[PDB]
Design a protein around this ligand. Structure first.
Ligand SMILES: O=C(Nc1ccc(N(Cc2ccsc2)C(=O)Cn2nnc3ccccc32)cc1)c1ccccc1
Ligand SMILES: O=C(Nc1ccc(N(Cc2ccsc2)C(=O)Cn2nnc3ccccc32)cc1)c1ccccc1
Lengths: 306, 306
């Protein structure tokens, strides 16, 4: 038992991290087969950060402009033989395939989805943590400018699913990046201008999963006979910065295991949002919305007890 | 900017995880050079878990009693050629040295220290997370029964420092294990009996470090001119389940960078302990005490807030 933020083991991703340098700027890249991916803003000189013309920047560079180095493991300097833009990514073709390329896929995750982040600095892995794609398609991470190129991923049956490359800090502790098709998560441009974020929202179904985790972990004081219909909850959610609830099979099975109904949990959310009354749930006095039902499922399998 | 629970990258440790089976019990082991470590309760029949005779169990086992397999990466079946007891651990000697043994050390951490955990199941790494050794030398982690043998570690300069091997769950969300000298953390025996947990406390210096991280991230509402001397706080701490504050250079450094004195932070603690007044710090409405000063140092290095 217990519930903690858990990341996928990072070894397979660590073997793919490299350092990329262009002019005075350096950050991290991801080396898969004969390709190195990094943010295109590596090309931008410090004085043009507000107004980058990436098309001009691209063609002002030669292949030799980009120095690519592998520092950890089987150390190497990698010759760049082509460079092109893929949305807000630079795609550097190099003359050697990464022999440690894992089986992999690319995906774009949806708000409410969790993934692991390998934080990197100067081409070396430095930390691992998990985030959730926020309703406004930001993430709440921990980064420096030198951490750009850090990689978000999930893992399933030996296959690494690459979903995020770190691009920018939008505001304090608020970050965004692109999927590997080069599309930036959310309504955000890779430039150094104030950009307004859409309002964030609690991910209801994640909150519900977390409350079920709590109940399986013996924490149940918040469960009452009180029920709220999904239609009534969703109307309330629109006025209180929660997402609308749509049930899933995974939630249904958690309800089955605990004997606590979805309508009870939605009622608990409404009460708890008004206040925790000096009490805690799984160590917290705020609603937790970054565990998905799948994340919870992985960490439970106890019999409901009490 | 941003502050998240960060773990050390796990790849170096992943290469050392194996599966160990004895009779019908299987769990995880750590393979370094020609040695495999695992909890000694792998020898115990299900029906003797209340009062195992580990010395008699050891004698009844042969080297052939133990099946060790590497299931990930370079797969292997490892032949056991010796077995001996090391406190609450078994030390198996195998006939093949792990070719991927990292530079490593062993140490035993003190209450208030953080370390990373690679959760494993049937000899396969499954997840990474960070814990803090509690005041009663338990940890608040996330483990299932097949997770025994999972490994706790830190990184120090390309050296893996192994500090924990998971042994048991004491109560919901409460765990302990041993260092690799085979000494169990805390007052706990490796038998299936209810054991008394000494009362936990808030680690004051960690809470202080967390408050400093908040200020460095532009969260400052809790800072007042109010001060409380160290000697006075410590008197207060004894009656309110906080550890005594002893100053360190790391904390002094944070105080200097933020211009907020330790005494102001201890005052904030006394106040926040009474209640957060409907406000939040770094997203939370409870005092966070599992970030060490060094954990915080590594995630800060932005420049001046007001
Ligand atoms: O510093 C340099 N470049 C740079 C690049 C990107 C950013 N932006 C905004 C942006 C995106 C596209 S254009 C501008 C971030 O959000 C970088 N970033 N990303 N995560 C960060 C966390 C903390 C601080 C900064 C962080 C800022 C600066 C530099 C250094 C030497 C030579 C040339 C350039
Ligand atoms: O299940 C078996 N053994 C076993 C071993 C240890 C434990 N204990 C307690 C303990 C310690 C020393 S002796 C007894 C835990 O705390 C295991 N543990 N460790 N972390 C856990 C999290 C959730 C549930 C259980 C967890 C429980 C059972 C088994 C299965 C087949 C054949 C023989 C034995």
């Amino acid at each position: 038992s217990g519930l903690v933020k858990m990341s996928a083991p990072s070894g397979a991703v660590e073997n793919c991290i490299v350092q990329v340098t262009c002019g005075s700027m350096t950050l991290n890249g991801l080396w898969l087969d004969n390709t190195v991916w990094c943010p295109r803003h590596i090309m931008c000189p410090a004085d043009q950060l507000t107004d980058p013309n990436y098309d001009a920047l691209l063609i002002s560079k030669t292949n030799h402009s980009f120095i690519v180095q592998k520092h950890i493991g089987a150390q190497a300097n990698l010759r760049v033989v082509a460079h092109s833009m893929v949305g807000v990514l630079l795609k550097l073709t190099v003359d050697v395939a990464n022999p440690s390329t894992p089986a992999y896929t690319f995906s774009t995750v949806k708000p409410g989805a969790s993934f692991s982040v390998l934080a990197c600095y100067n081409g070396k892995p430095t930390g691992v943590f998990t985030v959730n794609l926020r309703h406004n398609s930001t993430i709440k991470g921990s980064f420096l400018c030198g951490s750009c190129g850090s990689v978000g991923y999930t893992e399933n049956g030996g296959v690494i699913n690459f979903v995020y490359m770190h691009q920018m800090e939008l505001s304090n502790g608020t970050h965004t990046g692109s999927s590997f098709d080069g599309v930036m998560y959310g309504a955000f441009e890779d430039k150094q201008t104030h950009q307004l974020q859409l309002t964030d929202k609690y991910c209801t179904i994640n909150v519900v999963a977390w409350l079920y985790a709590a109940v399986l972990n013996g924490c149940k004081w918040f469960v009452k006979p009180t029920r709220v219909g999904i239609v009534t909850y969703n109307e309330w959610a629109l006025s209180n910065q929660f997402t609308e609830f749509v049930g899933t099979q995974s939630i249904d099975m958690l309800a089955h295991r605990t004997g606590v109904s979805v309508e009870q949990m939605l009622a608990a959310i409404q009460s708890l949002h008004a206040g925790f009354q000096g009490k805690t749930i799984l160590g917290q006095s705020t609603l937790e919305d970054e565990f998905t039902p799948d994340d919870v499922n992985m960490q439970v399998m106890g019999v409901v007890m009490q």
